[PDB]
Design a protein around this nucleic acid. Structure first.
Ligand SMILES: [Mg+2]
Ligand SMILES: [Mg+2]
Ligand SMILES: [Mg+2]
Ligand SMILES: [Mg+2]
Ligand SMILES: [Mg+2]
Ligand SMILES: [Mg+2]
Ligand SMILES: [Mg+2]
Ligand SMILES: [Mg+2]
Ligand SMILES: [Mg+2]
Ligand SMILES: [Mg+2]
Ligand SMILES: [Mg+2]
Ligand SMILES: [Mg+2]
Ligand SMILES: [Mg+2]
Ligand SMILES: [Mg+2]
Ligand SMILES: [Mg+2]
Ligand SMILES: [Mg+2]
Ligand SMILES: [Mg+2]
Ligand SMILES: [Mg+2]
Ligand SMILES: [Mg+2]
Ligand SMILES: [Mg+2]
Ligand SMILES: [Mg+2]
Ligand SMILES: [Mg+2]
Ligand SMILES: [Mg+2]
Ligand SMILES: [Mg+2]
Lengths: 50, 62, 205, 151
RNA sequence: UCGCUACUACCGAUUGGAUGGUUUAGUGAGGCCCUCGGAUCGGCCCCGCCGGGGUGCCCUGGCGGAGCGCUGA
RNA sequence: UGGUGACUCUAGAUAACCUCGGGCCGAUCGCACGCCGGCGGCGACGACCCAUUCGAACGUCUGCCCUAUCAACUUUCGAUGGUAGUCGCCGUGCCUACCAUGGUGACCACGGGUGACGGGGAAUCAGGGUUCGAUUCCGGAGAGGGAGCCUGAGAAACGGCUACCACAUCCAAGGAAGGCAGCAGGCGCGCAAAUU
RNA sequence: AAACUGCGAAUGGCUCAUUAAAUCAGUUAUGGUUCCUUUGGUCGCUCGUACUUGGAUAACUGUGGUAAUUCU
């Protein structure tokens, strides 16, 4: 699983590679265009909404 | 047991510096007040009117 | 798709012919557009030459001429009474050309009572409302009363029509084919045909 | 009455009957004005059309069709179809090799306005061509001349 | 006629086989039409708080927060 | 008002209608630059609707090779006609509904066969014929076989697409892509036919 | 250059499997229809932000995926 992440207001991107089953647990059984806060994603994220 | 709620999400246009004018110039011209702009407009308008009647005299000269 | 071509067919004698060419665009048939009474629904089709055919799935209003007194008003359609083609088509209430239909008497009776200042389809109970009495009984000026009085010689109506108004529903027939046209428009049944069709629908019972 | 056989009402599409009148003119008579047209090639439209009561849309005189095309003649053989007859045209086809003709014939189905009547098998009918009326019927009967043995 | 050799076509069980063409019936991919469906994407309103203008309100602006409000695709 | 051999024609008058899957009315481009803060010359695209051109599509009349070891054929599932519709770009059993019982046939229908695309033509010929015309012009059909549609003024298009059947290419085995009856050229078939 | 838009790709080329009043030929009709284009006609005939209006998207920038494509 790779994540392709984008900051619109800044106008930037990064390709992150995530292998953790939990981090993806938060994303499974999800439809497109839904908002999930990225928490399990890492320590830094926290209040980040994706 | 069911979901009756339909979420309404909002769209926001942020600001970015456009290449050749940094966010300081965009905001410098944006936040410029009505006195400043009205002065600039009427001054450029009168400069243009003078150049134009000068070129009307330069039409009738030739 | 549906080919309205002639070459799938027996000869005059009846020997079947083997088709020389496979089906051509211009010989195409489309599916049947059946037209029901309800809130207005219409689908544009693009046809040969690139022109728009207006197709009617649900109709409500249609406009009609009351031919005797030469008027035409935009009315609401109620029901399909009779169809020469198919009884099945009455049952599902389908609008085709030349099927027969009930319409609101209302805008007609209004026009009429404004033209002739006379009672139409009102109960013998005679009960009236202020607007009605001010339109019908009204007030006149000399030149006016003479005009209206001069028309009063003219306006009398076939007993059949008269009754229709009393019931609120008029018998009419559709001259335009909504299927290709997009509107169901037509004329009120007067006189001989009216009596005829009345005989057919009493015969339907 | 007797004019209306069919499920639908039988009209003359271009004429408006229901024009209202005084009760003094209703007692006089009801005569619905015929629509009849003069067909062009000099066939006088028969008396029986212009007076007559019948209604046939496909008749050349009292109805909507236009006679343009070939004008042919033939002889009536079989009339059991309603408002149409089968006439046969005979002719001689020349075979070059043998320098002689052979006989031949063709059968035309052709429509016949109810104004003409007493049209009797084996009599000469002159027809003119119309736009297609039916599957096999492209023609229309313009005038009927009796067989040679009429009395 | 019989006999010998050679070559053609014929009858012949084998419900003989093969292919082609139509077609009865059952099955029925895929488009097209109709009735639905409604993931999502908007717009208008609803308020809160604040800034400018016009007279507590009105016209705007700036954000935000929210409603099974009601509309388009 | 005007027009035909003939209109239910063209034009006129009256009442209304007008599609949210909307009809017309130009929110456009260039080159010259001039005139009394205003005026405009030439063009380019657009556009509803007439008319016109290229057509196209259905009809009319007459014409085709062999066959009886094919004599009756079609019609419950349209055959033939009637009446009203639906569908279509319109005329029409085109299709539905309801009636009628027709229509074709020794003047050869119907059925079968064709080493059958039809013509313009070719070969051969005193006169008459017989045979051949896949092939450069005109018309028709078809793009492996059938079917079904998008797009458009115009295709039921195959150097578009969607299936099924028959074939066949790539694969990391998950998937993807095919259509020379265009030119070359290759295989096969064959007595039989040219340069990537 | 590219990309959006407009137009064209329905012609032309090939072949002769099917197809027997069918195709086709001469003949006529469309008063029973459709017609890009071209040519001429029309285009203030309607009585009811305009000195200019709204949103998006491609090339382009960038982050990517798949063994594979004129994929996205
Ligand atoms: Mg057009
Ligand atoms: Mg079956
Ligand atoms: Mg299906
Ligand atoms: Mg009929
Ligand atoms: Mg009809
Ligand atoms: Mg039937
Ligand atoms: Mg052949
Ligand atoms: Mg030949
Ligand atoms: Mg040839
Ligand atoms: Mg060749
Ligand atoms: Mg050719
Ligand atoms: Mg083709
Ligand atoms: Mg091949
Ligand atoms: Mg085009
Ligand atoms: Mg095809
Ligand atoms: Mg090819
Ligand atoms: Mg091609
Ligand atoms: Mg080749
Ligand atoms: Mg060899
Ligand atoms: Mg050779
Ligand atoms: Mg392009
Ligand atoms: Mg062009
Ligand atoms: Mg023009
Ligand atoms: Mg890129």
């Amino acid at each position: 699983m790779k994540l392709n992440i984008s900051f619109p207001a800044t106008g930037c991107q990064k390709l992150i590679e995530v292998d953790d089953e939990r981090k993806l647990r938060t994303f499974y059984e999800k439809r497109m265009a839904t908002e999930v806060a990225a928490d399990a994603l890492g320590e830094e994220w926290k209040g980040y909404v994706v | 047991x069911x979901x009756x709620x339909x979420x309404x999400x909002x769209x926001x246009x942020x600001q970015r510096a456009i290449t050749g004018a940094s966010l300081a110039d965009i905001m410098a011209k944006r936040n410029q007040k009505p006195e400043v702009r009205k002065a600039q407009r009427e001054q450029a308008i009168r400069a243009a009117k003078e150049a134009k009647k000068a070129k009307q005299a330069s039409k009738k000269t030739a | 798709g549906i080919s309205r071509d002639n070459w799938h067919k027996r000869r005059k004698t009846g020997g079947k012919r083997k088709p020389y060419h496979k089906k051509r665009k211009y010989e195409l048939g489309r599916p049947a557009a059946n037209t029901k009474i309800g809130p207005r629904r219409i689908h544009t089709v693009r046809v040969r030459g690139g022109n728009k055919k207006y197709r009617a799935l649900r109709l409500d209003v249609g406009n009609f001429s009351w031919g005797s007194e030469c008027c035409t008003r935009k009315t609401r359609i109620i029901d399909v009474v009779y169809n020469a083609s198919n009884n099945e088509l009455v049952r599902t209430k389908t609008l085709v050309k030349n099927c027969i239909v009930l319409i609101d008497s209302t805008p007609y009776r209004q026009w009429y009572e404004s033209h002739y200042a006379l009672p139409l389809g009102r109960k013998k109970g005679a009960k009236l409302t202020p607007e009605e009495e001010e339109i019908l009984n009204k007030k006149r000026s000399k030149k006016i009363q003479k005009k209206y009085d001069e028309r009063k010689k003219n306006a009398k109506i076939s007993s059949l029509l008269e009754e229709q108004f009393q019931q609120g529903k008029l018998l009419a027939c559709i001259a335009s084919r909504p299927g290709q046209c997009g509107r169901a428009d037509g004329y009120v049944l007067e006189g001989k045909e009216l009596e005829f069709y009345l005989r057919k629908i009493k015969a339907r019972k | 009455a007797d004019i209306q056989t069919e499920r639908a009402y039988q009209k003359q599409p271009t004429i408006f009957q229901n024009k209202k009148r005084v009760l003094l003119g209703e007692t006089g008579k009801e005569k619905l004005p015929r629509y009849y047209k003069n067909i062009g090639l000099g066939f006088k439209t028969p008396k029986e059309a212009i007076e007559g009561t019948y209604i046939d849309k496909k008749c050349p005189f009292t109805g909507n069709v236009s006679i343009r095309g070939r004008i042919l003649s033939g002889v009536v053989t079989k009339m059991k179809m309603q408002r149409t007859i089968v006439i046969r045209r005979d002719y001689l086809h020349y075979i070059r090799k043998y320098n002689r003709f052979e006989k031949r014939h063709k059968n035309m189905s052709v429509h016949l306005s109810p104004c003409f009547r007493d049209v009797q098998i084996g009599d000469i009918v002159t027809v003119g061509e119309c736009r297609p009326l039916s599957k096999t019927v492209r023609f229309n009967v313009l005038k009927v001349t009796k067989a040679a043995g009429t009395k």
